């Protein structure tokens, strides 16, 4: 159930896993925050995440559970 609870834990999970890397955290917020501004397109949001969590499946997967069939996530080898 993608609700405020699912989004809350996700953030807390991304903060702990990247406790030694604040850059990654700040990057995720930028993508979402940038989207709210209505400037960055969808493909841009999934792209950043797909690159931000290149070595984190549980991350790219957790977010994938939110995106609809329309805008899915890709894993560039």
């Amino acid at each position: 159930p993608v609700h405020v609870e699912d989004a809350l834990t996700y953030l807390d999970q991304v903060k702990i896993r990247f406790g030694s890397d604040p850059a990654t955290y700040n990057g995720f917020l930028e993508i979402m925050k940038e989207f709210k501004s209505q400037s960055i397109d969808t493909p841009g949001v999934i792209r950043r995440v797909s690159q931000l969590f290149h070595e984190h499946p549980d991350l790219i997967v957790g977010f994938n559970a939110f995106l609809p069939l329309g805008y899915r996530i890709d894993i560039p080898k």
């Binding site: 993608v2 405020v4 989004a7 979402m32 989207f35 709210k36 969808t42 995106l67």
Partner: peptide
């Protein structure tokens, strides 16, 4: 994407 708007909202103000 309503899930994208809720995601940024909780990140910008989730408390």
């Amino acid at each position: 994407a309503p899930q994208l708007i809720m995601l940024a909202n909780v990140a910008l103000t989730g408390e």
